[PDB]
Design a protein around this motif. Structure first.
Motif, PDB file in Angstrom:
ATOM      1  N   UNK A  87       0.602  -1.280  -0.160  1.00 35.20           N
ATOM      2  CA  UNK A  87       0.212  -0.130  -0.254  1.00 35.20           C
ATOM      3  C   UNK A  87       0.872   1.603  -0.064  1.00 35.20           C
ATOM      4  N   UNK A  88       0.722   2.614  -1.135  1.00 34.22           N
ATOM      5  CA  UNK A  88       1.443   3.300  -0.878  1.00 34.22           C
ATOM      6  C   UNK A  88       1.140   4.369  -1.190  1.00 34.22           C
ATOM      7  N   UNK A  89       0.621   5.128   0.063  1.00 36.11           N
ATOM      8  CA  UNK A  89       0.654   6.664  -0.540  1.00 36.11           C
ATOM      9  C   UNK A  89       1.614   8.149   0.035  1.00 36.11           C
ATOM     10  N   UNK A  90       1.412   9.398  -0.306  1.00 38.16           N
ATOM     11  CA  UNK A  90       2.250   9.883  -0.190  1.00 38.16           C
ATOM     12  C   UNK A  90       2.841  10.198   1.096  1.00 38.16           C
ATOM     13  N   UNK A  91       2.486   9.288   2.351  1.00 36.76           N
ATOM     14  CA  UNK A  91       3.407  10.004   3.466  1.00 36.76           C
ATOM     15  C   UNK A  91       4.630   7.949   3.606  1.00 36.76           C
ATOM     16  N   UNK A  92       3.750   7.161   2.630  1.00 34.70           N
ATOM     17  CA  UNK A  92       4.189   5.815   2.949  1.00 34.70           C
ATOM     18  C   UNK A  92       4.281   4.698   2.632  1.00 34.70           C
ATOM     19  N   UNK A  93       4.940   3.439   1.734  1.00 33.48           N
ATOM     20  CA  UNK A  93       4.693   2.435   1.819  1.00 33.48           C
ATOM     21  C   UNK A  93       4.452   1.418   2.858  1.00 33.48           C
ATOM     22  N   UNK A  94       3.192   0.636   2.913  1.00 33.33           N
ATOM     23  CA  UNK A  94       3.253  -0.798   3.889  1.00 33.33           C
ATOM     24  C   UNK A  94       2.954  -1.659   3.010  1.00 33.33           C
ATOM     25  N   UNK A  95       3.661  -2.385   3.980  1.00 30.75           N
ATOM     26  CA  UNK A  95       3.602  -3.826   3.398  1.00 30.75           C
ATOM     27  C   UNK A  95       3.678  -5.487   4.015  1.00 30.75           C
ATOM     28  N   UNK A  96       2.753  -6.163   4.052  1.00 32.01           N
ATOM     29  CA  UNK A  96       1.775  -7.532   4.562  1.00 32.01           C
ATOM     30  C   UNK A  96       2.384  -8.376   3.600  1.00 32.01           C
ATOM     31  N   UNK A  97       2.959  -9.519   3.998  1.00 40.77           N
ATOM     32  CA  UNK A  97       2.870 -10.765   3.500  1.00 40.77           C
ATOM     33  C   UNK A  97       2.217 -11.703   3.638  1.00 40.77           C
TER      34      UNK A  97
END
Length: 107
Positions: A87-97
């Motif tokens: 998930x990428x938005x202006x503030x940052x990108x998160x990831x989960x696997x």
């Protein structure tokens, strides 16, 4: 100048796929700036189909969390691999696997 000062970045929660013919990988991604949700499958770009579809469910206006499920109506043993939500938005990108077992027995 500011209408939304609240900048909530995206955090990604993923959940273990629930074993049933219609497989569901429930996700929770929070943030006010809308992040682009992308599934990665075995390091390759997973593109949603009619069998494998990303559900975006309507969140409550009082929660900052967007909810949904990667639901597979018709699962295939090629899907037996690693899923990852970016998930990428202006503030940052998160990831989960998520590594799920889509093991078929042909016929």
């Amino acid at each position: 100048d500011d209408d939304d000062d609240v900048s909530f970045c995206a955090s990604v929660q993923l959940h273990t796929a629930v074993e049933m013919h219609h497989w569901c990988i429930p996700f929770s991604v929070d943030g006010q700036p809308a992040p682009s949700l992308r599934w990665l499958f075995n390091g390759s770009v997973l593109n949603e189909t009619s069998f494998i579809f990303t559900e975006f469910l309507e969140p409550a206006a009082n929660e900052t969390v967007r909810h949904g499920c990667l639901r597979l109506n018709q699962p295939t043993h090629v899907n037996n691999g690693n899923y990852t939500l970016l998930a990428a938005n202006p503030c940052g990108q998160a990831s989960a696997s998520i590594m799920a077992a889509f093991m078929d027995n042909p016929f």
